[PDB]
Design a protein around this ligand. Structure first.
Ligand SMILES: Nc1ncnc(Nc2ccccc2)n1
Length: 131
């Protein structure tokens, strides 16, 4: 699965980016090279800082701060919904957002807190649709 693109007809691999995420998610599943624990409502989630900061303005802020980037444990606001966070973390590693009637408000609040603008805009659009 490859194709050509641009002024220099460079070869692009269609599945490369998704294959990288698949492999990063496999690392996460096996706890390989995870370098941070996120604590949400007394539940712990192991992850890779680079993936978190690639997806979230809040994590980008934290992990580019000279002081804060040395923490191996990051606590979130205790009002954040841990399912909401799990849904968003899974999205970071898969591109798949498991949005449902019963979780959309929690997901949207969590995505606001995490500064995940495209997810927030998507939640808003689904909410507007059901008004
Ligand atoms: N997480 C994960 N799982 C499986 N394989 C890899 N990387 C890899 C292994 C062999 C050849 C090419 C890539 N990463």
């Amino acid at each position: 699965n490859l194709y050509f693109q641009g002024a220099d007809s460079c070869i692009q691999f269609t599945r490369h980016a998704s294959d990288v995420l698949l492999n990063l998610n496999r690392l996460r599943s096996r706890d390989i090279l995870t370098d941070v624990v996120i604590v949400v409502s007394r539940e712990q989630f192991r992850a890779h800082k680079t993936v978190l900061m690639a997806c979230s303005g809040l994590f980008y802020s934290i992990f580019t701060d000279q002081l804060k980037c040395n923490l191996s444990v990051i606590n979130l606001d205790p009002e954040i919904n841990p399912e909401g966070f799990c849904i968003l973390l899974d999205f970071m590693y898969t591109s798949r957002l498991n949005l449902r009637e019963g979780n959309i408000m929690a997901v949207m609040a969590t995505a606001m807190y995490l500064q995940m603008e495209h997810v927030v805009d998507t939640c808003r659009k689904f909410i507007k649709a059901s008004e």
